[PDB]
Amino acid sequence: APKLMTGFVRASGYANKVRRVLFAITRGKVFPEEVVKAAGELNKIIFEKLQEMGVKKEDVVRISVDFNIEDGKIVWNLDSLEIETYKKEEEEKLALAMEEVEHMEKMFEETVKELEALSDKLREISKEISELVERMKQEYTGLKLRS
Amino acid sequence: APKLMTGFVRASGYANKVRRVLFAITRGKVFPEEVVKAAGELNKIIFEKLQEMGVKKEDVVRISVDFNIEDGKIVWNLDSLEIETYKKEEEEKLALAMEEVEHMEKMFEETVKELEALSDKLREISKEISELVERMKQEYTGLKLRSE
Amino acid sequence: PKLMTGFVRASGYANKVRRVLFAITRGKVFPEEVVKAAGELNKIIFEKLQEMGVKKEDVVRISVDFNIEDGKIVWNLDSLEIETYKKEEEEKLALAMEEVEHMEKMFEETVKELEALSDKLREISKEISELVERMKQEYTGLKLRSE
Amino acid sequence: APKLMTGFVRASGYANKVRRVLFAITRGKVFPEEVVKAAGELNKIIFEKLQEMGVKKEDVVRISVDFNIEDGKIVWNLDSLEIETYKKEEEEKLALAMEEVEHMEKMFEETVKELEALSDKLREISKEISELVERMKQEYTGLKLRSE
């Protein structure tokens, strides 16, 4: 029985961290659309639960839950889910450390956005090239076309 | 009334040349599907007129037809077609040129072949890379995804 | 100018310093100087860290001022200051940090994958440029790149 | 014995064609700089000779030369140099044909020019990407770097 776990994650972006782990865990087994929908459903549950524990933005949480993959759907036995909670005030040291993790992932996101912009510029060139190579075949040769 | 004319071309690769020229005079107005179809249709009509002339494959020929574009479609009155014939033995000098032409044009194809090989081999990476970026986005960021 | 690492497990403290050094200096110094300066201080730490008897599992905080001077990195060691946290004390913290390490190393594998592709690409590009030229030489009266 | 020959080529184009044929013939045997100098050297020699013959722009020529590769240089027996000329009024039919092959090859170049623009633009992204990858290595990982 496979198991999602987030480990120590600042509440601020617990939502992200479960999904991130969900993609990682189910890679290849399920379609991405399902991964988002599934994590979305759980994330909405752990939110209302987190409020019942009176959790603030700054606190650090922890998440364990079991799920099974069945004909390309992610189903979890919700009662196999457990949340641990850590008030910043109690574990001030850990709680800071977790803002540091957060900020260094926000920093990261800028880098990816850069990369995305390049890979985009590239598939663009790639298309324009491959497109043109054909346009030559047409006008300058008698080779087999793509028609 | 626009028109296609081929220019001096060896009988050997007459079929190719007419298709080459057609794309040219019709870029961005027609579709390749409609062009490749009409270029096969009109060159069959030439071929039956071509055996009718008794013209060999070492010879040289001039082709000029009128044509018209109708809602993306390609249409031509055939009694506008005009084929000139030039026997090898008569212009032994001319025919030798269209043979050297044809050879280098084929020699060119082999280079295009490698280019296509390169273009695709790239477009693979282009796609693998862009897809890896998504895979990163999903696993390592809170960024919006192709998926959502 | 001040590099600080914040909470990092003792094991990958080496990396963290350099990683951040690159970040802070980007553009201002050649990379060769970043590795040299980083390694120089990283040793100075390692030694000064053993004197305090720090295992690999413990967590640490490191702050040192430095100066960019005619393209070189100089730091006054006096400004350097190290906090040290025993796993025994912060069992909760030290886990979180180990958790980061695992994740950071999991990440390395993705990068390697990406490089693998960028390389395969640079190669393909170099070939295409190389071939495009060879076309110009054989089929055009165009100007070449050796005239 | 290696032997560069152009075949039928309009007077205007001779210059290129020989250089093109020299590259194609001596592939991987000599550095391009040598080829372009060598073609450069012969091409001026054949120009002088081409004026003596009184050849106009429109006429067609054929060229043959013997040459040998020595230590990475291209040397030719210049007395092996053999030219033929075909004034337009004599082969009026051939001259027009070689004119069309000229204008065609020029319509071609505008394409290679475009392709080149793309190849470059690409090479650039390759460089930018491949660099971005290194920056990630140094900033986000403890992997081995190009700087160790």
Q: CB distance C128–B122 less than 8 Å?
A: yes
Q: CB distance C90–A93 less than 8 Å?
A: yes
Please choose, from the candidates D121, A73, A40, C117, the residue with its C-alpha nearest in 3D space to the C-alpha of residue B131: C117
Contacts 24+ apart (CB under 8 A), D35-39: D35/D74, D36/C144, D36/C146, D36/C147, D38/D73, D38/D74, D38/D76
Q: CB distance D20–C122 less than 8 Å?
A: no
Is the CB of residue D130 less than 8 Å away from at least one CB of chain C?
yes
Contact B11, B55 (CB under 8 A): yes
Angle at A99 (CA atoms; ends A97, A101), nearest 5 degrees: 70
Is the CB of residue B120 less than 8 Å away from at least one CB of chain C?
no
What's the CA gap between C20 and C31, in Å, rounded? 12
Q: 3-state SS string over chain B?
A: CCEEECCCEEHHHHHHHHHHHHHHHCCCCCCHHHHHHHHHHHHHHHHHHHHHHCCCCCCEEEEEEECEEECCEEECCHHHCEEEEECCCCCHHHHHHHHHHHHHHHHHHHHHHHHHHHHHHHHHHHHHHHHHHHHHHHHHCCCCCCCC
Residues 6+ apart with CB under 8 A from A34: A72, A73, A74
Please choose, from the candidates B88, B27, B18, the residue with its C-alpha nearest in 3D space to the C-alpha of residue B49: B18
Residues 6+ apart with CB under 8 A from C128: A129, B115, B118, B119, B122, D119, D122, D123
| Angle, helix A92-140 to helix C91-139, in steps of 10 degrees | 20
Q: Looking at the partner chain, which of D7, D86, D97 has a beta carbon nearest the beta carbon of B8? A: D97
Contact A127, D125 (CB under 8 A): no
Angle at D134 (CA atoms; ends D129, D136), nearest 5 degrees: 95
* DSSP H or E segment with residue C9: strand C8-9
Please choose, from the candidates D33, D121, B119, B111, the residue with its C-alpha nearest in 3D space to the C-alpha of residue C135: B111
Which residues lie across from D65 on neighbouring strands?
A: D4
What's the CA gap between D87 and D58, in Å, rounded? 8
Q: 3-state SS string over C50-61?
A: HCCCCCCCCEEE
Any idea which residue has 């696993």 for tokens? B139
What's the CA gap between B27 and B30, in Å, rounded? 7
Token output for A4: 């999602």
What's phi and psi for C11, nearest 5 deg?
A: -50, -60
What's the CA gap between B18 and B43, in Å, rounded? 8
Contact A42, A25 (CB under 8 A): no
Q: How was this structure determined?
A: X-ray
Contacts of B93 in chain D (CB under 8 A): 86, 91, 94
Contact C30, D143 (CB under 8 A): no
What is the C-alpha radius of gyration for chain D, rounded to an integer number of angstroms?
23
**Structure's resolution in angstroms:** 3.5
What's the CA gap between A79 and A94, in Å, rounded? 28
Largest alpha-carbon pair distance within chain A?
77
Q: Looking at the partner chain, which of A111, A126, A132 has a beta carbon nearest the beta carbon of D115? A: A132
CA dihedral in degrees (C26, C27, C33, C38; nearest 10)?
-10
What's phi and psi for C74, nearest 5 deg?
A: -120, 130
- At A147 the three-state DSSP class reads coil
Is the CB of residue D134 less than 8 Å away from at least one CB of chain A?
no
Contact D135, D145 (CB under 8 A): no
Token output for C58: 């413990």
Cα separations in angstroms, B67 against A100, B2, B4, B16, B41: 72, 6, 7, 18, 13
Pairing between strand C2-4 and A3-5?
Answer: unpaired
Residues 6+ apart with CB under 8 A from B89: none
Token output for C9: 């497990």
What's the CA gap between A20 and A1, in Å, rounded? 20
Q: How far is CA C111 from the centre of its chain?
A: 13
What's phi and psi for C44, nearest 5 deg?
A: -45, -35
Tally Cβ neighbours within 10 Å of residue B49.
Answer: 13
Contacts of A126 in chain D (CB under 8 A): 122
What's phi and psi for C5, nearest 5 deg?
A: -100, -30
- Closest chain A C-alpha to C26 CA, distance in angstroms: 13
- At C141 the three-state DSSP class reads coil
Token output for B7: 């220019």
Is the CB of residue A114 less than 8 Å away from at least one CB of chain D?
yes
Please choose, from the candidates C126, C135, A140, B100, the residue with its C-alpha nearest in 3D space to the C-alpha of residue D24: C135
Any idea which residue has 């194809």 for tokens? B109
DSSP state of A80: G
What's phi and psi for A128, nearest 5 deg?
A: -65, -35
CB-hemisphere CA count at 13 Å for A55? 25
Q: Looking at the partner chain, which of C23, C35, C115 has a beta carbon nearest the beta carbon of D139? A: C23
Contacts of B122 in chain C (CB under 8 A): 121, 124-125, 128
Is the CB of residue D81 less than 8 Å away from at least one CB of chain B?
no
Please choose, from the candidates B77, B94, B76, the residue with its C-alpha nearest in 3D space to the C-alpha of residue B85: B94
Contact C91, A86 (CB under 8 A): no
Please choose, from the candidates C87, C76, C53, C60, the residue with its C-alpha nearest in 3D space to the C-alpha of residue C2: C76
Residues 6+ apart with CB under 8 A from A21: A4, A5, A6
Any idea which residue has 């082709």 for tokens? B63
